[PDB]
Write a protein that binds this ligand. Sequence first.
Ligand code: ATP
Ligand code: LEU
Length: 1004
Amino acid sequence: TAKVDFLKKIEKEIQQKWDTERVFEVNASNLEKQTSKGKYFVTFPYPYMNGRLHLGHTFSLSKCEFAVGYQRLKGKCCLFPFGLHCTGMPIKACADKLKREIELYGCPPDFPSKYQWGIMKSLGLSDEEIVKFSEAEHWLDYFPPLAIQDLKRMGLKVDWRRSFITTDVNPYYDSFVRWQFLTLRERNKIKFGKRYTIYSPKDGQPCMDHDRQTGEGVGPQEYTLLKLKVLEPYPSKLSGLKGKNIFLVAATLRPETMFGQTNCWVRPDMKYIGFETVNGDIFICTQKAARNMSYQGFTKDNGVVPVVKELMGEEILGASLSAPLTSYKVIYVLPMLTIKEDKGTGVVTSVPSDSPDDIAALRDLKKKQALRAKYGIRDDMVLPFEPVPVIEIPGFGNLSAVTICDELKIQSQNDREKLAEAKEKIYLKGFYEGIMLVDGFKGQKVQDVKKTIQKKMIDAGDALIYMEPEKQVMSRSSDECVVALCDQWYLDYGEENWKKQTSQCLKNLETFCEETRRNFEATLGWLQEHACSRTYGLGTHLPWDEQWLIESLSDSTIYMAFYTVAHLLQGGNLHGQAESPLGIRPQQMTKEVWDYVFFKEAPFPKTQIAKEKLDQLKQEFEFWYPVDLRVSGKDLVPNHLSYYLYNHVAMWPEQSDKWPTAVRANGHLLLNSEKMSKSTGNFLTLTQAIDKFSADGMRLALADAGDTVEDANFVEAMADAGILRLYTWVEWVKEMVANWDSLRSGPASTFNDRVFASELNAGIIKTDQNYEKMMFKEALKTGFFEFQAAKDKYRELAVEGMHRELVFRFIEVQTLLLAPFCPHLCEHIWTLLGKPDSIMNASWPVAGPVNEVLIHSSQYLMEVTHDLRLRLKNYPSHCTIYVAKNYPPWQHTTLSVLRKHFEANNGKLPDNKVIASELGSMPELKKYMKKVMPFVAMIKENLEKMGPRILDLQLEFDEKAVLMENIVYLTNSLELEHIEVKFASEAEDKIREDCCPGKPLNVF
Ligand SMILES: Nc1ncnc2c1ncn2[C@@H]1O[C@H](COP(=O)(O)OP(=O)(O)OP(=O)(O)O)[C@@H](O)[C@H]1O
Ligand SMILES: CC(C)C[C@H](N)C(=O)O
């Protein structure tokens, strides 16, 4: 119960020792003469502050909290500073979903957790102060300070002075941003243009990834829209617009097929709309493909849909229709009753010759009279149109769609599963092997012409360009974004000579697996015009079209170097509004001033702060750059971290040594094995967990969740496993510091001492190796569970009394491995072993030699003792045990050349049909040829569990003498009286023969 309160007692105290001696602070002036093993510099991506931080936030940053704790014991100075993000609509569109809930339901509010109000009362905030949040400033007055007090109680190795806030509410960071961006105009890494990006009407701006709430990586996405003439007789429901040419509008992907046009598809219970183009004509689409067109510069008044009739395609079927590109001089509009309303325009091109949905849906209106019934389609309109050979794909003939639907045997337009895989092998095959048929292109492949076919339909005014969200994208403000076409300021992320440079920063960077380098190795290939011009959201304003703000991801890319000087400029304020310790007014640092600080070969400027101050920050910068590490989620890999490199390349143009050195992708966080969603009661915040289980326990779990890229698993049930094994360790250390009088003195020479010493030293090592590969799962595995594994064997296996000055060894070396997992615990220990310094001043306990014969031996006892505790529970008092000198007959010529198939094989023997093979053929083993492979079978499975020796005809340690050494751990925890040790050529005959060395047996 009070398992855990006790930890948080010492915890918070150490926290307030750690700060009133500023352990984790370091300054570059000081820490440059004393280069012990150099600078380590890691980073967390700073997190947006629409909230305190949650567990899956810490797991992400944990990766370094351990890292720094480990290196600074290996001999490196550590800088891991934390900054907080707010340059985003996350804070904005959160605060505003709030104020609208007040505007519409009053305050205190009244609704017909899950609402914006009912999330910040779900944090315990007074009714009077929740309303203080509507203006987004009171988020920044409020949330940044709360995060830093949160990590206080994690114990996070931070030089806190290097914090900040990120928006223009801060004057220091702000000029920094500016400098970046003056340079990127100056280096042609921004340009003004009009380009297709993904856009929120309700935001009134672009919204690339980190402004969204759906589809974090969805692209400016292309379509070919065909302009079909509605024809006289106009259908009875089209009266009014006598005044214009009225167009049906329908969005294809393969324009190269539109000769195969037979009719038009609309689902008749869908709601269409027809507007005025700026052309002056009338279109007709979904309500949404309309409002897309609009923001694409279709409607005379961009963004606004000049709707003139609402209606449902039930009123529309059967109206005559000239189509571009097809011999069917008149096609009609027909019903395909499944038309999803996400994609397209609710009006779907019909190529029955060459897509199965068309030929299927069209089969029916020909198959079933009583379908032209519910929709009154005369017989001219359906029957006589039969498909058109426009592509011939070899395998399937001219009309690849009808050909393969008579052989997938599709009955309806509703056989959907089989209509889908009909489509599969045929849409893409048609797209290379395709060769056009009808003239202009006689026999030219599809891949060639698809471009120039759509070419001629535009030029002739029969079609123009539609673009749409690939998949639906809702915004941070709950808006269905749509693909617009707009003035923006865009980063040239695709200009070749920039791309090819940074891929030499991708290759030169170190990732941690090759599913990481894979991801970027993608994103690099696709990145081009990425807008940074937001006119809405918190931020910093662009300094030459000032009306523009900066999008969250693009003011966020070289900021790390701010972490290098924020402690001298912002003095460890958060808004950096207070006065600097280095007296530089926020005004007083200008594009020349930065430039000196940040480009080595930059000239002193005529600044208004003299030389002695500004030489300082070039010293700090050039000392910690470049950035050794970034541990993020796996989710900023393709967007932020891939701009991390463009920016770093393009701003230091040749300081290759300043570029990023490493970055480690890990996955998202599972609390107790489920999506951590505040929806379903499965979610935890740092201020929530740290008070649930001691941070040193919550810390401990974290290291023990995942260290792949694959999603990690925080398991409460194991979170509490720690708070136990941790306390049961402390009250063991209290036990020895209570009982020096009973730990054996003098020489540390007992067989198990020698076992345990070279065990422990073989531990330390594995834990060094696991730590450096940053596999904190394993660093913990080897460092605690396996370190207790020996202390806990050594206590039993040595009934001779554990040695004193090899206990204090263990308590020390084990404390010292745990430092980065539990700096609080371990420091509580360190003072109580009487060291008068602090445990972040510690050094890696270098390991003594390993006596690996002395391990490979002790596995022999800790093994078979767990063996004959099985033969026992059948039924004695008086016991016997049998061994062997060399291998018995049959299994010295089994084993003598079982070798045969590895010294002249280098990797393995042949599978187990040719096992009985030519040993059965032995003049010897015909007798036991039924047990030879059973004994052969299981002695392979400890050749990847014991190493490669298991086929030496000799061991490395005297099989007996090493047992006569521990016989009394045996005659004690086995509670039999005497136990003889014979060599079994004295034994009974049934074990005289088929027991060998390593395989002992016993009488009773
Ligand atoms: N379990 C998690 N889920 C999401 N992000 C996580 C998780 N654990 C750690 N993170 C990290 O938390 C950080 C929060 O800061 P930032 O504001 O830059 O990202 P984020 O916007 O919170 O991410 P997202 O919208 O994808 O959840 C991110 O860098 C991400 O690396
Ligand atoms: C629904 C499809 C058969 C229409 C057109 N061939 C396209 O792929 O968009």
